[PDB]
Design brief:
The chain is 24% helix and 20% strand. It has 459 residues and is of the alpha/beta class. It folds into 2 domains: 218 residues, no CATH class; 213 residues, no CATH class. The strands form 5 sheets. Strands 1, 2, 3, 4, 5, 6 and 11 form a 7-stranded mixed sheet that branches. It has a 6-stranded mixed sheet with strand order 13-12-14-15-22-19. Helix 7 packs across helix 10. The structure holds N-methyl-N-[2-(pyridin-2-yl)ethyl]benzamide and zinc ion (3 copies). One zinc ion (ZN) binds next to helix 10. One zinc ion binds next to helix 6. It comes from Severe acute respiratory syndrome coronavirus 2. It is found in: Host cytoplasm; Host endoplasmic reticulum. It catalyses: a 5'-end (5'-triphosphoguanosine)-ribonucleoside in mRNA + S-adenosyl-L-methionine = a 5'-end (N(7)-methyl 5'-triphosphoguanosine)-ribonucleoside in mRNA + S-adenosyl-L-homocysteine. Interacts (via N-terminus) with DDX1. Interacts with nsp10.
């Protein structure tokens, strides 16, 4: 069981207002045929236009909510809405475009999908709350056939051109007019009671209904993300490398070690309470502090309430020493904390829009993160940049310009002049730091944290 069988039944109740008289007994095979597509008994990598929930979860980066509303159906204009916020009007002759024929609407669809998806995925997955018009509109902008490769590269083809009779991926499709071998999934097949808005609004207050096709397209994809990543979590699913994943994860490990060591030394805490991942390792192994771990998986729905993490009777005294919350999202951090909190608002190829202000951060695994909330950090302050090192000043083994910086906390800078080794290490650490910040991570620390206390650790 790899793909969705075309002989699987498809519930047609949601389709009968736009398509009256539709048979209750229906397969994907018959539905695809009714949509104007012929699969010709083809065993060439595209067995079904529709896919399973498990296949959709593996391809979450390709998700594009799609809805079609009858503006007035052969004789009436259609409003095509996409979870990108785009609304196109197709005439049969929050962005709102005026009525145009399909031959130009399809050019716009290919440009919009290519620009949104070229740095996310090798395909498109149309996420539907199917009522009929969206399925019957597909023949006007979609072509299907055997799996193909791009004419300019080795990537799979996602677009087709009638002008040149050629195929292209999302990177090489400028001037292409047809979406080729798209995938799709009808959320209404998952077993829901009531309409789209009533199921969406149960879990999300961020997406409203301005009564346009893009609002429904947005709500549909949000509801699909809630079902697949919020109420259901699967951290075994691996996702391909599409950007700076490796550099970001390595930077996160460097910054954590740097900041936690410096806190321990500067304030000499006797105990550290490490709250978060149950598979966490001591980030400063050569530490003399009493290191105590507390297990909490990444919260994907709402941030943990500090009252439930800490209270109901462990050291018991979380007020003793320091608390380390490294990607452990809580509602209000205690004053004696060191915190790394992912900012869901960040724009990047790793961060996809999520449910109720949250975001879906996809880096090796998929992690739905509750909305970033500035009030969580009232007891703390922003952690400023600094580099600390007690390692020997020794080059060993890239050209040089001398480093001058008030934030290079080293014996050499204390002594008046930064050595080559510590300048190279400072510059590498500043690059790792900037990578992690730009990726969306934000750092917070207890108000008494002062790097001035690190200079006396050189005596
Ligand atoms: C300084 N602290 C805090 C606990 C402490 C406080 C006072 C004396 C000893 N240990 C460390 O755990 C530590 C970190 C990095 C290197 C070496 C020791
Ligand atoms: Zn290509
Ligand atoms: Zn929503
Ligand atoms: Zn040095």
């Amino acid at each position: 069981p790899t793909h969705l069988s075309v002989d699987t039944k498809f519930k047609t109740e949601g389709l009968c207002v736009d398509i009256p008289g539709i048979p209750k007994d229906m397969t994907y095979r018959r539905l695809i045929s009714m949509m104007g597509f012929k699969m010709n008994y083809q065993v060439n990598g595209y067995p079904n236009m529709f896919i399973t929930r498990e296949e959709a979860i593996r391809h979450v980066r390709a998700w594009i909510g799609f809805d079609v509303e009858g503006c007035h159906g052969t004789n009436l204009p259609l409003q095509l809405g996409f979870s990108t916020g785009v609304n196109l009007v197709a005439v049969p002759t929050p962005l709102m475009y005026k009525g145009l024929p399909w031959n130009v609407v399809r050019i716009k669809i290919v440009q919009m999908l290519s620009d949104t998806l070229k740095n996310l995925s090798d395909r498109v997955v149309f996420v539907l709350w199917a009522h009929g018009f969206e399925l019957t509109s597909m023949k006007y902008f979609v072509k299907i056939g055997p799996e193909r490769t791009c004419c300019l590269c080795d990537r799979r083809a996602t677009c087709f051109s009638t002008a040149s009779d050629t195929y292209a991926c999302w990177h090489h499709s400028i001037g292409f007019d047809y979406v080729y071998n798209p995938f799709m999934i009808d959320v209404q097949q998952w077993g829901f009671t009531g309409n789209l808005q009533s199921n969406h609004d149960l879990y999300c207050q961020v997406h409203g209904n301005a009564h346009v096709a893009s609002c429904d397209a947005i709500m549909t994809r949000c509801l699909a993300v809630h079902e697949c990543f919020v109420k259901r979590v699967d951290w075994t699913i691996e996702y391909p490398i599409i950007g700076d994943e490796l550099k970001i994860n390595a930077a996160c490990r460097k910054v954590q070690h740097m900041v936690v060591k410096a806190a321990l030394l500067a304030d000499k805490f006797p105990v550290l309470h490490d709250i978060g991942n149950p598979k966490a390792i001591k980030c400063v192994p050569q530490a003399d502090v009493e290191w105590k771990f507390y297990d909490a998986q990444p919260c994907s729905d709402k941030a943990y309430k500090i009252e439930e993490l800490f209270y109901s009777y462990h050291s018991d005294k979380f007020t003793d020493g320091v608390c380390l919350f490294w990607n452990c999202n809580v509602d209000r951090y205690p004053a004696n904390s060191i915190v790394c909190r992912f900012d869901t608002r960040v724009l990047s190829n790793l961060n996809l829009p999520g449910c109720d202000g949250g975001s879906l951060y996809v880096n090796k695994h998929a992690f739905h993160t509750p909305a970033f909330d500035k009030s969580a950090f009232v007891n703390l302050k922003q952690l400023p940049f600094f580099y600390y090192s007690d390692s020997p000043c020794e080059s060993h083994g890239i050209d040089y310009v001398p480093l001058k910086s008030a934030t290079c906390i080293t014996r050499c800078n204390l002594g008046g002049a930064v050595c080559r080794h510590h300048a190279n290490e400072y510059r590498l650490y500043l690059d790792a730091y900037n990578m992690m910040i730009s990726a969306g991570f934000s750092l917070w620390v207890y108000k008494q944290f002062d790097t001035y206390n690190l200079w006396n650790t050189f005596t």
